[model samples]
Target chain A: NLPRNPSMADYEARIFTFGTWIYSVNKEQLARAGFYALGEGDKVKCFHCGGGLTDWKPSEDPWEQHAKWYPGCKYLLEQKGQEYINNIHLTHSLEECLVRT
Target chain B: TNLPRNPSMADYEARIFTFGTWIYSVNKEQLARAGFYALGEGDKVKCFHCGGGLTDWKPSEDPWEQHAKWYPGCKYLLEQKGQEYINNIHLTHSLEECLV
Candidate 1:
């Protein structure tokens, strides 16, 4: 399950709307690869600038989350895995980036 | 003014990893680092990951059959290093992300 954030209202809509950049990231793998962010936990971090991640794990139906933060990126203090930040420098986890898995 | 122009790097080389124990330091043995091999003149090594070529190349040893020959420290990092173990370090690209 993704962590809970206070800034987001829904989790599905947040996923479909150019959130793949963020959703495609595997905080665990990124952190292992020398990247980190605040509150993203020690397990998952940034894939580019090594910043803190504040989003939660994606829901079963990310579309629902996508609806919460469509168009405008809301910097809400509430974190619970909602939007999907696309075209960003995010990395995939071993499970997501690997083929022999 | 009906002439076509072209641009390309003549001395550029494909990114690749060398075989050795140090390659295992990052548990990259199971990974297949990816890059481009210049399809033709004026072609670009567009990255498959970001669709934008803006990543550095990392080369290392192939872990197909030399798992037992890696350094002890290398083995330790692969087995015990936590997710946050590597912060502010280089990242290995996925093999599947690249197109042949």
Candidate 2:
């Protein structure tokens, strides 16, 4: 069974209603990736996994961040595909390697 | 009759093993390493993890490049090649639009 955040029932609708939200992340892109804002500064949560992310940089991508932090999330896996999940992990690993040196 | 119908193996491992039984033009090891399993028709292969399928392999074509080109969203592909590498692939493809 697919997981969902019960509290986010109208998440998509709320995103659409926001019209022009103030954030570096695009509102439509956020909604398309199953994210809804948390009424705070650039904080958003996925409707299906309830995984949250914040502090969006202008170049930061919604789908990439979602996959990077929550690889096992079924909703993300279904939407973004395993290839995306792998790349996120690989990128993080590369960064981790650089940090260790 | 004692053989297991579906062996418990790493998805990639099992997929790579299928190349032994597969009859196709594409190199099984190469496809498996790129995370694909034979689909048993016209050399069609699908990723064991993400279920992204592709066919019509060109002898000179790179498996990873094709995987990125068509299945950029696949987690396995991403894991093997980082975001920058994948992004570069798409960027290169996008550059083709300028010529049209």
Candidate 3:
């Protein structure tokens, strides 16, 4: 499998990829959170992980989605730290509605 | 403007996505240095910088030479090895092919 890198590593460059984007999610947050917009319904991808997400929950956080989909990603580990990653994974699994079931 | 397909794997760690699985004559370390990552499909590997892919390699094919041969216009190749190296490979390949 080939990793897609159409997204620029530069945040400013990636930000500009979404300059014309008009969506519920702001471009700045998405870019700063390491996503480069694909311009199809706000499809964005991580520069390091190549994780693709097509506009996650409008209310959901960009960083959270990044870690949730591709946890242990290089940028995630470098930028967000293990605590943040573990927390996200822990929170995601918090829905163990059958912990005792 | 041929964009690099996998800038993420420009990282050596991602390319080492090698190690236990690698059994090629060409060292995986050399492949990483040459900006390639395994596609997990036999010997197929693609450059993280230029998206050029190579596979079914000969035992002695140098990574850089093969990279330059197939993707002379790659920015990463030019940036790392300089035009001199690329030109040499191009010239050599052309010469070798001319005799054929």
Candidate 4:
């Protein structure tokens, strides 16, 4: 908590689910960031940028995972798990399979 | 907008209630399809009752836009006409208004 209710802060969630299969990848391995529970007062000021976003709802991560969905996230999928992979996947294999063919 | 329902839980249960103890009736996907944006970390979420922040969800945005108890209301509440309008100086009530 940011020492107050409904605080303003910006941060990311990892290991969280966006759907049944899409989870925020490597949230625990923030590399340089820390993790915390969501709530009033707890705040995260972006270390990279001072810009802020709050209320803390979750959305589908546009990134890809190493398991279940291979050839996913071009950044990570192709690098074989390199740390700098950063991209969002809008189409799913099931959806792509149906639409492409 | 004659929009559809959002992913939300309307029960009066306390936030401390266990995760599996509640029943949700809204279909979040339909709500998102209707134009509601998903919640995200640092996104400002308001309470339906008092119209304030109840708490900031961890990593915020719903895994999906739909959920057992979550939805988007209106964006105009925070929408800005320009960068100057969105500047923190214009935002009032630090105690009441918060970031995600």
Candidate 5:
């Protein structure tokens, strides 16, 4: 029951909201990563987790951000595996370690 | 006399042709916003105001760029995007293409 808005599983549906979309990130990756546009500026919501994100910056990857923010997401774990999640999580930890120490 | 060629079709009507599910690298709303209506043949589209035709758009070639590039003579273009926007597009294309 954790996943929400399951109807948006279709890539076509997710990609449709990006009509006239003016953003740095491509719609392809966003839809592929279980995200759909929310029609509120650059804001988007994950189909599975219902987690929302916005204000996308240049060169920002949709997948990494999704994993970064919502680590407990079952969809992210199921499709990407624990190793991938750990890698993403650890990368942030490593970055912090580098900056801190 | 720079006037609207197809004043009958509103912008909303133009967007109707772009409806339905299809993967377009360039957004359909962007095309309609730039005064184009889909021809229903491939990705081909014609201007509502100028009747200018364009197709095979690249991901980088947005609706405005293509509109200004092909039909610079269309008064609708001048009225909307204006001469400066058009010439800027012209010179930008000219300068950008020449770069290595």
Candidate 6:
């Protein structure tokens, strides 16, 4: 897919979710990554990629959640540098390695 | 600063109007038609919708081709054109970069 902004309708709808949601993660951070809550137990979807992630822990990282599930999102890739993305994957690999050991 | 993830303009005219004072290598008309607006930076034109941006325009370079080549994830370009068109630009660019 090519790069372009999400429609106004979609964006506004996503932003609307932050109003009544009760979550530890900052809403602005999730919005910055183009995510909005699906209202199903903490599930959220990126506006750009439609990628969803749920089961958020109290200290779950929104950007990390986004990069983990929707690395292909242009909004995520553009806003977060390539190095930032690489480091995320690297961290996950290291965690997986540590888990196996 | 975090960039806006949603499209800012409704039409190319509104986007182009934002560049009334633009003084750059690429004309505002061409940039707007390609879905770009001046980011108020040197020659960094951002897509009105996708918010992707690029700079350092050569006189012979085409805006749409460059947009697709550098920002294949732009939905506007994908919707207006197609994946084949964007892929061709990337393929050509990759070969060009390899040749140099």
The digit string of per-residue lDDT tens for model 5 on A7-94 reads 8978999889887688889988998898888887999999888889998999788878988898788888887766566666655655
Clashes of each: 44, 14, 0, 36, 0, 12
Better of 4 and 6 by TM-score: 6
Query: Which is the better candidate, 1 or 4, if ranked by DockQ?
Result: 1
The sequence of per-residue lDDT tens digits that candidate 5 reaches over residues B10-98 is 46565556646546798878888888877778888888877899988888778887889999887777777767566656655554454
For every model in order, what is the iRMS?
A: 7.7, 10.5, 26.1, 16.2, 20.1, 14.0
lDDT of each: 0.29, 0.72, 0.77, 0.29, 0.78, 0.73
Number of the candidate with higher DockQ, 2 or 4: 2
lDDT of 6 by residue, A19-99 (tens): 888878788777766888876787887767777787778887888888777787777788766645655665565555555
Give the Cα error of residue B1 in candidate 4, in Å: 53
Question: Fraction of the real A/B interface contacts present in each candidate?
Answer: 0.04, 0.00, 0.00, 0.00, 0.00, 0.00
Q: Please tell me the TM-score of chain A for candidate 4.
A: 0.23
CAPRI band for model 5:
incorrect
lDDT of 2 by residue, A1-101 (tens): 87687665565675864465776678777787778777776778887778889988889888888887767888778766666677666556555555554
The DockQ for candidate 6, computed on C-alphas, is 0.02
Candidate 3's residue-wise lDDT over B10-95, tens digit each?
Answer: 67887777556888898988998999888888999888988988989999889988999988899999988876566566554544
Per-candidate TM-score against the hidden true structure: 0.16, 0.48, 0.47, 0.16, 0.49, 0.45
Better of 4 and 5 by TM-score: 5
Please list all clashing residue pairs in model 3, or write none if there are none.
none
Clashes of 2: 14
Q: lDDT value for candidate 2?
A: 0.72
DockQ of each: 0.04, 0.05, 0.01, 0.01, 0.01, 0.02
lDDT of 3 by residue, A7-36 (tens): 487788998888688778877888888888
- Candidate order (lDDT): 5, 3, 6, 2, 4, 1
Off by over 4 Å in 6: A1-101, B1-4
